[PDB]
Paper text:
Various microbial metabolisms use H+/Na+-translocating ferredoxin:NAD+ reductase (Rnf) either to exergonically oxidize reduced ferredoxin by NAD+ for generating a transmembrane electrochemical potential or reversely to exploit the latter for producing reduced ferredoxin. Electron acceptors are either H+ (E°′ = ‒414 mV)4,5 or NAD+ (E°′ = ‒320 mV). The latter electrogenic NAD+-ferredoxin oxidoreductase reaction is catalyzed by the membrane-spanning multi-subunit complex Rnf (from Rhodobacter N2 fixation metabolism, in which context Rnf was discovered) thereby linking ferredoxin and pyridine nucleotide pools. On this basis, we postulated an electron transfer route between ferredoxin and NAD via eight [4Fe-4S] clusters, one Fe ion and four flavins crossing the cell membrane twice related to the pathway of NADH:ubiquinone reductase. Architecturally, Rnf shows the highest relationship to the electrogenic NADH: ubiquinone reductase complex (Nqr).
For cryo-EM structural analysis, we elaborated a quick four-step purification protocol for the Rnf complex from [name] and integrated the homogeneous and active enzyme into a nanodisc. The overall resolution was determined to 4.27 Å. The Rnf or RnfABCDEG structure consists of membrane-spanning RnfADE (blue A, pink D, sky blue E), extracellular [name] (brown G), and cytoplasmic [name] (green B) and [name] (orange C). The five reliably identified [4Fe-4S] clusters are semi-circularly arranged with distances between 9.0 and 10.5 Å to their corresponding neighbors. The small FdI domain is highly mobile and the density is too noisy for reliable model building and for detecting an iron-sulfur cluster. The Thr153 and Thr164 hydroxy groups form a covalent bond with the phospho groups of FMNRnfD and FMNRnfG, respectively. Most interestingly, [name] is rotated ca. 35° relative to NqrC27, which changes the position of FMN relative to RnfAE and [name] as well as their redox cofactors. In the Rnf structure the potential Na+ channel is found in a locked state. In the structurally characterized resting state, the channel is blocked by two hydrophobic layers. In contrast to the wide vestibule with FMN as part of the side wall in Nqr, the equivalent extracellular half-channel in Rnf is occluded by loop 175–187 protruding in a hairpin-shaped fashion from the solvent-exposed outer wall to the isoalloxazine of the central FMNRnfD.
Author numbering:
A (entry chain E): 2 to 195
B (entry chain G): 2 to 188
C (entry chain D): 7 to 310
D (entry chain A): 1 to 191
E (entry chain C): 1 to 435
F (entry chain B): 1 to 30, 95 to 266
Write the structure that this text describes.
């Protein structure tokens, strides 16, 4: 029963954004309100466990010249299953729209993961670090997106906390200004750990 | 490291084919929830904009000929309650695609902007309820943009610092008003 | 007990005698800019400078260093972010802009002169992008007013009746605290050239290329009227000519000065913005290592 | 929509890395020296472009009798997977180590987040062909231009001792690129 | 005439007004001489001499065991107290011969009093006997310098007359007191080489010196005036050749690849002293200077006097200097101590006051661009001095920082007072280490 | 069912054919006890005069190329300017009081710290062999007299007094050969200056 450390290994060291710096592409695009990114990280989490459970049953029969084309197709089939869930079961009609939903087949993390680990890792030895990796993913979002939202509108979870005139800052929510929050925050993660 | 193309090609085609079949089965099963939910989101926005109408039917014989791309007729059973008019006036930075509700009595009941390319965070957006809610109960006559204090009966307060956007939105609604008088009053 | 090293003189002027000469050199442009604006505009310039300087003083106590405040880097950056604002803003919005002007652009990137861009343009781009409605005001003679750069396209205000070309030199034109007084800014650049603080190779080429773009564009009562309009007289003299942003090479300078008007005048005319002396210097400042690599002085004995 | 409106549209005003954040994951990677860093974008002027021709063949008539767009997300991207294992064979043809100096990103050249994003972008406006191809060459020149510009900053940042300890290497690069985005924000009214 | 110059440079302050118009008094020695064999560039000669011998002016002190070494001669008659090792101001433990002065001034006779009959190979030999150093700057023996391997044909001989440095009046006098003799030697230096025409290259700032000279050049063909503009570093060998014959010196090269061979005027007067007056280097002019000295002075020292007694002959310290200087203010090394013997490569001595000598702990470089503007060679120094600190040697070689002359001009203009040259010197030694 | 066939046959017009272009073209073109650095210098401020005040870089590698060969009266000690802290990223080495000192338990033996010093004061030693010399001098000791009170005076009794003779008087210095040494340790009282130092883990 190694799941407890395999998770803390996936979030303190294997973590996608603060350490590994794969997968920034939603992580800056989705941040403009934090719920949209918590749903981006939850949808990323269920596709992240669901890739490794199917691909590690498939793992033995791949010639070394085609280590990637089977992986991008099974992630395309898994990705579609969720986008067809997005149009139907639970749209909520904000996470259905302002997320760039197709971009999870070309998320930099998971294919930069499955070649590195789930190929040589066991089929079972894949479900635990994928759940943990997805968990870190939302965590590596939610601490950032509360900061970018609170310095933006001030409406954490969409809800007001200050007189509207004092906080009309918005450039954070804009495209240059999220990078500065990552360059404050990951530097704060390294300075404690220095 | 045997890499012959015949072995590879048949295994490749298989894996891509099984994924395509499974996706096709998912596609046939999912069409009906998508159709009800799409209809529901259009009807929900429609009911919020035009609350006296319960049923909406597109006037399919009239292709729009100016900035209007289509029209949806609003009924409560047999009675005509109004129209939703899709318009796209040229703003400062691009088209502003919006829906405009117009009652048969000649009041603009409100607007809803759908496109996100208008004024990207500059000033205060036109999608804000403090601006967009001001169009409720206005007469279907030409509205004018003011610098300064609001009078009400014909004035729309410009968003501060974004007077060009307010002139563009007010121009688009007034052209929709002109379309209402020429094509829509009495059918 | 005798001190030693290999050159023994190293005498000309200290960086305090560079900077402080610049802080004294803009004084007729500021004193000509201030008396239309009264005390009303003085509070933003003193509070923005003192907030900028003490914000560098907090970062000298972070990683330890000798305080460079006495080298007078910190005052010049503060005196130039205050030039960019119209006078009616609450003070805290510039104070957070001076805290961005030091703590991110200058001190994360190194010490004095290691940063790849001018801080005042970066704090100004952060300022105008975050609260444009606070920046919309053009306070002079009470009322909010039109400025020449908007009416010159003709696309914007209905109200236009342009000021006569002599009135801009006096400073009677509205807009921001320094830039309107172009003649006293010429008095400060005429002082700065006498000390050999800066070569002609940036201002002459940059003013010449935007004059060519405004002449083939044709846009004005005269082509000459655009050169005193706006911040462009500050941007040929105090802004782009900054040591740290500017390229080192003699030919590297004139490529940066020709190409600054390739990007500024296009935002002025083809662009939707009122002016391009800002967002244009940040792109040409980011081009500099690719200029400085390929453009080098010729070696005294190259092969062939 | 005309060709000069389109080619500027990825080059400057709406560059893929500097506002949209398409392409950000490589962009911290092989910025290390400009002499290597231009060859990743020289790889990107093929991949981005020949896939734009091959995705048009799906949009020409291979999709069309089904009269459903839904399959495309599982589709042309497999053809993007075909074009990248073709180009690992020609990176090794004379000079492998050209892009091998940080070859962990060599696979991510299958799966750059921008490289779908011209194509889904091309497939979410239904563009006529040659506007899609000049949109591809302008996104590749803008990706090559921002990568070479960060490479000229990070040659200077590796030879500067004065930066605070915790900040060394990567986080300052996030401070630049967003400042580099601050440079491109003023283009917004040109197009 | 019109004032030619090379493209880039500085204008260092002209300290010469303290010293410019005073007689060269002889300094008679008081304390004991020591002679260090190490004064020529390359490996020192071992002395032949051993303890208790009688010794005299003009004796060779030690045979030159190598292709590039030159004969020593004693300043003074005396006796050998001890083949003592001693420090130089560099702190190398050079071999030396103590010679107490007897006070008696015996000298061996030798005379010739014609050059014109002589074979040119007899001149190069008598100049190897003389043992003469090239006097200014870096200190070659002149006998290798007069003998290129044949394929690099000469076009001309400029003298490098242009004493660029502040507070160094030592060559201006040799021009007032004895202008024929220097043009006499020049005619000689030109007997060893035909095809090469001669040129003087004096600065305009001593306009009185060339106007004394201008009557001497009228009655003879190949020498002629070439006045030059006042700009440091005119006295560097690579820039004066671009200044006059307008070829650029090849990188990595020798002056014979440019076809011309610069010399100091001091070497000229002493090559005239060897072929005609028959004697080698007993002596050279120092210029002691600086306001901390009780008066400005212009001594003719006898070689190997201790410097302390020499500055006490000049009037001594009104206050203690913070930086006594061998050589010129820029190029020269500073003293480890006042105690060191004087040597042929000294050309002057400075004793800087607080009003100049106080610098500051350096600020970070501002990217001012002045240092590229002032290098004569158009080297781009801030990347080179920044390259030694990380030891990224491929950046040192692509920038061609092996080329640099160490003029000291690039430190001199910097507002930050970064001192670059010591990083340039450590990188120039490391490129000899590993390439 | 009839519309289900269209996704699989429409996939097959790109189906095999990318692997037809792939592998048909891919077949066309497919130790001792560990060493540890030690300073061989003892020059805390008071124990050695410096001859001169030093303008300069405050790096030790820069200070070689000035007249006087750096600030110490000894030519062979470390300057204390601390350029070797920059190369040891592991940070065993602390400058204090104008000398380097390795911490005895952090150092890897990585050995770049010898090559960076112009004066070559560092010598790698075995960790076990606790007696260790501590000067770099190459001089007659009357010149040490006015310079370094801690210094070896080339005094030469130590070659008479070691039974194992792990000592040799190379180049007017002690030079231990540590493997011959038994660590008998009488030699630490033998030096008047205590230029030898036992590390005294007992
Ligand atoms: C930067 C620099 C400046 C020099 N300035 C002088 C000078 O002012 N006067 C001088 O006689 N030699 C000067 N020299 C020395 C020359 O390089 C060359 O040695 C001299 O011109 C001829 O004297 P020589 O016979 O020793 O070679 C300078 C050298 C350098 C590198
Ligand atoms: C005439 C002159 C003007 C300058 N103007 C600026 C300026 O506007 N902004 C700035 O950040 N630095 C400026 N500097 C340099 C400033 O002290 C510092 O280098 C900045 O941090 C630029 O990197 C200027 C320097 C001089 C000599
Ligand atoms: S010393 Fe070197 S860097 Fe300085 S001016 Fe002379 S050549 Fe240029
Ligand atoms: S070293 Fe001095 S002169 Fe050279 S660039 Fe730096 S500041 Fe300017
Ligand atoms: S004698 Fe010992 S302590 Fe003194 S300088 Fe030399 S090595 Fe250092
Ligand atoms: S390596 Fe030697 S000289 Fe250099 S700093 Fe360390 S002890 Fe001092
Ligand atoms: S450089 Fe290597 S050997 Fe020297 S101290 Fe550091 S870790 Fe130990
Ligand atoms: S006994 Fe002491 S002083 Fe004598 S040589 Fe040995 S260590 Fe040096
Ligand atoms: S420790 Fe004992 S055995 Fe070893 S060298 Fe010193 S005296 Fe000899
Ligand atoms: Fe990505």
């Amino acid at each position: 029963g190694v799941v407890s450390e395999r998770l803390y290994n996936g979030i303190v060291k294997e973590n996608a954004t603060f350490v590994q710096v794969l997968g920034m592409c939603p992580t800056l695009a989705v941040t403009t309100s934090a719920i949209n990114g918590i749903g981006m990280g939850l949808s990323a989490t269920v596709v992240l466990i669901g890739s490794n459970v199917v691909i590690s049953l498939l793992k033995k029969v791949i010639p070394d010249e085609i280590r990637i084309p089977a992986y991008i197709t099974v992630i395309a089939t898994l990705v579609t299953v969720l986008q067809f869930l997005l149009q139907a079961y639970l749209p909520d009609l904000n996470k259905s729209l302002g997320i760039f939903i197709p971009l999870i087949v070309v998320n930099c993390i998971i294919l930069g993961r499955a070649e590195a680990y789930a190929n040589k890792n066991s089929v079972g030895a894949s479900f635990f670090d994928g759940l943990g990796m997805g968990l870190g993913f939302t965590v590596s979002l939610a601490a950032l997106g509360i900061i970018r939202e609170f310095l933006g509108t001030g409406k954490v979870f969409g809800a007001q906390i200050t007189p509207d005139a004092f906080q009309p800052a918005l450039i954070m929510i804009l495209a240059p200004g999220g990078f500065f929050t990552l360059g404050i925050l990951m530097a704060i993660l390294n300075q404690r750990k220095l | 490291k045997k890499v012959s193309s015949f072995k590879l090609g048949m295994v490749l085609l298989l894996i891509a084919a099984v994924c395509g079949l499974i996706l096709g089965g998912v596609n046939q099963v999912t069409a009906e929830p998508i159709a009800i939910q799409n209809k529901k989101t259009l009807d929900e926005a429609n009911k919020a904009i035009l609350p006296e109408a319960s049923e909406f039917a597109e006037k399919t014989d009239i292709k729009g000929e100016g900035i209007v791309l289509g029209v949806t007729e609003g009924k409560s059973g047999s009675d005509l309650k109004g129209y939703t008019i899709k318009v796209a006036p040229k703003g400062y930075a691009g088209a502003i695609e919006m829906m405009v509700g117009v009652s048969t009595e000649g009041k603009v009941t409100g607007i809803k902007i759908l496109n996100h390319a208008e004024t990207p965070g500059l000033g205060a957006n036109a999608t804000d309820p403090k601006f967009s809610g001001q169009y409720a109960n206005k007469p279907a006559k030409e509205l004018k943009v003011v610098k300064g204090a609001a009078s009400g009966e014909d004035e729309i307060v410009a968003i501060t610092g974004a007077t060009i956007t307010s002139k563009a939105v007010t121009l688009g609604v007034n052209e929709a008003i002109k379309f209402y008088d020429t094509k829509l009053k009495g059918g | 007990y005798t001190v030693s090293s290999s050159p023994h003189i190293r005498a000309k002027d200290t960086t305090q005698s560079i900077m402080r000469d610049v802080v004294i050199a803009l004084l007729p442009a500021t004193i000509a800019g201030v008396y239309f604006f009264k005390l009303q505009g003085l509070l933003v310039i003193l509070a923005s400078v003192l907030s900028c300087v003490v914000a560098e003083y907090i970062w000298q106590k972070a990683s330890k260093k000798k305080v460079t405040v006495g080298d007078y880097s910190a005052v010049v950056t503060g005196l130039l972010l205050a030039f960019n604002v119209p006078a009616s803003i609450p003070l805290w919005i510039p104070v957070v802009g001076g805290f961005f002007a030091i703590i991110v652009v200058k001190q994360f990137f190194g010490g004095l002169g290691q940063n790849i861009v001018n801080p005042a343009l970066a704090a100004r781009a952060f300022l105008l992008a975050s609260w444009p409605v606070q920046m919309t005001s053009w306070t002079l003679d009470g009322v909010t007013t039109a400025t020449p750069l908007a009416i010159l396209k003709g696309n914007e205000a209905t109200g236009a009746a342009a000021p006569d070309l002599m009135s801009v030199f006096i400073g009677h034109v509205g807009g921001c605290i320094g830039e309107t007084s172009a003649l006293a800014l010429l008095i400060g650049g005429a002082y700065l050239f006498y000390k050999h603080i800066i070569d002609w190779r940036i201002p002459v080429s940059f003013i010449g290329t935007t004059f060519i773009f405004t002449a083939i564009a044709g846009r004005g009562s005269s082509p000459v009227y655009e050169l005193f309009a706006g911040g462009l007289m500050l941007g040929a003299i105090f802004m782009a000519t900054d040591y740290a942003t500017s390229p080192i090479t003699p030919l590297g300078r004139i490529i940066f000065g020709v190409g600054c008007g390739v990007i500024t005048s296009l935002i002025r005319i083809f662009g939707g913005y009122p002016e391009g002396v800002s967002y244009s210097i940040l792109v040409m400042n980011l081009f500099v290592p690719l200029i400085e690599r390929w453009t080098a002085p010729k070696i005294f004995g190259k092969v062939k | 929509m005309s060709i000069f409106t389109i080619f500027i549209s990825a080059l400057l005003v709406n560059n893929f890395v500097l506002s949209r954040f398409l392409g950000i994951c490589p962009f911290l990677g092989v910025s290390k020296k400009v002499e290597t860093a231009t060859g990743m974008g020289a790889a990107v002027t093929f991949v981005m472009a020949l896939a734009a021709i091959m995705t048009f063949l799906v949009e020409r008539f291979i999709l069309i009798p089904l009269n459903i767009q839904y399959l495309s997300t599982l589709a042309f991207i497999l053809v993007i997977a075909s074009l990248v294992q073709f180009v690992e064979m020609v990176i090794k043809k004379v000079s492998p180590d050209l892009y091998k100096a940080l070859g962990i990103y060599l696979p991510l050249i299958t799966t750059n987040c921008a490289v779908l994003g011209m194509a889904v972008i091309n497939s979410n406006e239904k563009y006529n062909l040659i506007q899609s191809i000049i949109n591809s060459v302008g996104a590749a020149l803008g990706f090559t231009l921002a990568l070479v510009l960060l490479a000229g900053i990070r040659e200077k940042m590796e030879t500067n001792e004065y930066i605070p300890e915790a900040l060394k290497g990567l986080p300052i690069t996030l401070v630049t690129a967003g400042l580099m985005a601050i440079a491109f924000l003023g283009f917004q009214g040109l197009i | 005439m019109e004032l030619l110059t090379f493209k880039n440079g500085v204008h260092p302050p002209h300290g010469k007004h303290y010293t410019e118009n005073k007689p060269i008094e002889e300094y008679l020695p008081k304390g004991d001489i020591v002679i260090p064999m190490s004064q020529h560039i390359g490996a020192p000669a071992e002395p032949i001499v051993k303890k208790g011998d009688r010794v005299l002016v003009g004796q060779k002190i030690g045979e030159a065991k190598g292709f590039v070494s030159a004969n020593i001669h004693a300043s003074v008659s005396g006796t050998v107290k001890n083949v003592a090792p001693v420090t130089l101001f560099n702190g190398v433990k050079s071999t030396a011969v103590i010679i107490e002065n007897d006070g008696q001034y015996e000298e061996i006779e030798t005379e010739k009093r014609d050059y014109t009959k002589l074979s040119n190979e007899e001149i190069i030999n008598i100049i190897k006997e003389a043992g003469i150093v090239g006097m200014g700057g870096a200190t070659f023996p002149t006998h290798v310098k007069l003998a290129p391997p044949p394929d690099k044909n000469i076009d001309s001989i400029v003298v490098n007359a242009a004493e660029c440095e502040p507070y160094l009046t030592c060559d201006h006098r040799m021009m007032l007191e004895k202008t024929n003799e220097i043009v006499e030697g020049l005619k000689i230096v030109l007997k060893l080489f035909p095809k090469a025409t001669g040129y003087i290259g004096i600065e305009d700032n001593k306009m009185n010196a060339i106007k004394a000279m201008q009557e001497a050049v009228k009655n003879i063909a190949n020498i002629e005036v070439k006045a030059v503009k006042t700009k440091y570093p005119q006295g560097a060998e690579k820039q004066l050749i671009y200044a006059i014959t307008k070829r650029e010196v090849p990188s990595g090269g020798l002056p014979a690849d440019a076809g011309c061979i610069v010399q100091n005027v001091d070497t000229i007067y002493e090559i005239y002293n060897a072929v005609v007056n028959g004697k080698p280097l007993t002596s050279r002019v120092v210029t002691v200077t600086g306001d901390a000295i009780k008066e400005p002075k212009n001594l003719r020292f006898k070689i190997g006097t201790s410097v302390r007694e020499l500055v006490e002959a000049a009037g001594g310290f009104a206050e203690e200097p913070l930086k006594v200087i061998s050589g010129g203010p820029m190029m020269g090394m500073a003293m480890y101590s006042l105690d060191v013997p004087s040597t042929k490569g000294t050309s002057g001595v400075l004793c800087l006051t607080k009003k100049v000598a106080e610098i500051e702990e350096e600020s970070n470089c501002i990217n001012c661009g002045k240092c590229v503007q002032v290098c004569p060679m158009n080297l781009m120094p801030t990347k080179l001095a920044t390259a030694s600190a990380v030891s990224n040697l491929d950046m040192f070689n692509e920038f061609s920082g092996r080329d640099c002359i160490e003029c000291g001009c690039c430190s001199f203009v910097c507002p930050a007072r970064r001192h670059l040259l010591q990083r340039i010197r450590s990188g120039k030694k490391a490129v000899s280490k590993k390439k | 069912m009839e519309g289900l066939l269209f996704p699989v046959l429409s996939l097959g017009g790109l189906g095999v054919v990318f692997g037809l272009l792939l592998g048909y073209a891919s077949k066309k073109f497919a130790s001792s006890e560990p060493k540890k650095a030690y300073v061989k210098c003892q020059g805390t401020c008071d124990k050695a005069k410096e001859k001169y005040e030093y303008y300069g870089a405050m790096t030790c590698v820069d200070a070689a190329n000035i007249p006087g060969a750096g600030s110490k009266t000894c030519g062979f000690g470390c300057l204390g300017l601390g350029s070797c802290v920059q190369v040891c990223a592991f940070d065993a080495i602390h400058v204090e009081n104008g000398i380097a000192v390795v911490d005895e338990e952090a150092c890897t033996g990585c050995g770049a710290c010898v090559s960076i010093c112009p004066k070559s004061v560092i010598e790698l030693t075995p960790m076990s062999k606790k007696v260790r010399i501590s000067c770099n001098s190459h001089d007659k000791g009357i010149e040490v007299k006015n310079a370094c009170s801690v210094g070896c005076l080339s005094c030469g009794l130590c070659v008479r007094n070691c039974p194992s003779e792990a000592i040799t008087m190379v180049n007017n210095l002690p030079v231990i050969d540590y493997d011959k040494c038994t660590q008998c340790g009488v030699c630490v009282g033998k030096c008047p200056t205590k230029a030898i130092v036992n590390l005294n883990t007992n």
